[PDB]
Amino acid sequence: DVQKKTFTKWINARFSKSGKPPINDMFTDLKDGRKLLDLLEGLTGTSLPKERGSTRVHALNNVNRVLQVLHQNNVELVNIGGTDIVDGNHKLTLGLLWSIILHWQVKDVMKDVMSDLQQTNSEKILLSWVRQTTRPYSQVNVLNFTTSWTDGLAFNAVLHRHKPDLFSWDKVVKMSPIERLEHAFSKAQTYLGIEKLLDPEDVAVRLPDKKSIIMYLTSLFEVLPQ
């Protein structure tokens, strides 16, 4: 309804901005597949075959190429197929457009957004990762990259979460902070190739070195499974 007006505008914007004519009704002019074929051509800088006949067959044919392409671009659609679009299914016609917008714009833009974010909110964005990763683990609460890692619990939680068959979590909560670390470091080492950068005596202290933690933490993460 609203998504109509705006999606129509957006597509029409895409069109005008490249010498191509606009459409009137988005649940019509879109059916025969032609327009969507244009949209994708301009969007991809590619040449796409267009069937000229004005009969259902061709409509389905064109719309199939459209979907075909999206698929080629790793943009698969849930319950959508030629006929849907060819027939004017409101719900799904939009759902398709949005898929395009989402892939070529919205998602595209995110790479840049991260670059802008990656220089400033680095340390902060990595903390919300660890918090989310070790959420399930009750006895683990990470607020920073210093004290929250002293009891050595947080270090294991990170490992465990993505390979619980590696060791017993309850078995850990039992051992001392020193064991808890000697362990994690040893585990990560044997099963992840990650070198034992830190030493327990170094991490189990009032204020442990922030840079050293983050550097080991990032080491772990690189080779971590998800």
UniProtKB/Swiss-Prot annotation:
Where is the segment annotated Actin-binding?
A: 1-216
Top-level taxon in the UniProt lineage: Eukaryota
Q: Subcellular location, in the record's words? A: Postsynaptic cell membrane; Cytoplasm, Cytoskeleton
- Specify the Calponin-homology (CH) domain's residue ranges: 1-105, 120-225
Q: In which tissues is it expressed?
A: Isoform 1 has high expression in muscle. Isoforms Up70 and Up140 were found in all the adult and fetal tissues tested and relatively abundant in lung and kidney.
User: Function, please?
Assistant: May play a role in anchoring the cytoskeleton to the plasma membrane.
Let me see what the UniProt entry remarks about domains. Answer: Actin binding affinity is primarily determined by CH domain 1.
> Can you state the subunit structure given in the record?
Homodimer. Interacts with the syntrophins SNTA1; SNTB1 and SNTB2. Interacts with SYNM. Interacts (via its WWW and ZZ domains) with DAG1 (via the PPXY motif of betaDAG1); the interaction is inhibited by the tyrosine phosphorylation of the PPXY motif of DAG1. Interacts with DTNB. Interacts with PGM5.
Protein's name in the database: Utrophin
Q: Gene that codes for this?
A: UTRN
